[PDB]
Amino acid sequence: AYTNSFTRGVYYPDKVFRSSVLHSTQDLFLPFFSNVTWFHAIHDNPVLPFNDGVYFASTEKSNI
Partner 1 sequence: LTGTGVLTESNKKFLPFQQFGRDIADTTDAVRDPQTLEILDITPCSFGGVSVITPGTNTSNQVAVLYQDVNCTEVNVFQTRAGCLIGAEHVNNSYECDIPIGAGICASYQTSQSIIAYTMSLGAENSVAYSNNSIAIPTNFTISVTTEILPVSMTKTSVDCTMYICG
Ligand X SMILES: *[C@@H]1O[C@H](CO)[C@@H](O)[C@H](O)[C@H]1NC(C)=O
Give the residues lining the site for ligand X (CB under 6 A).
Answer: 2, 35
Q: Which of 21, 41, 47, 64 binds partner 1 (CB under 8 A)?
A: 21
41 binds, among partner 1, ligand X, none (CB under 5 to 8 A by kind): none
Confirm or reject binding of residue 17 to partner 1 (CB under 8 A): yes
Q: Which of 11, 3, 58, 2 is nearest to 30 (CA)?
A: 11
Q: Closest separation between CB of residue 47 and partner 1, Å?
A: 31
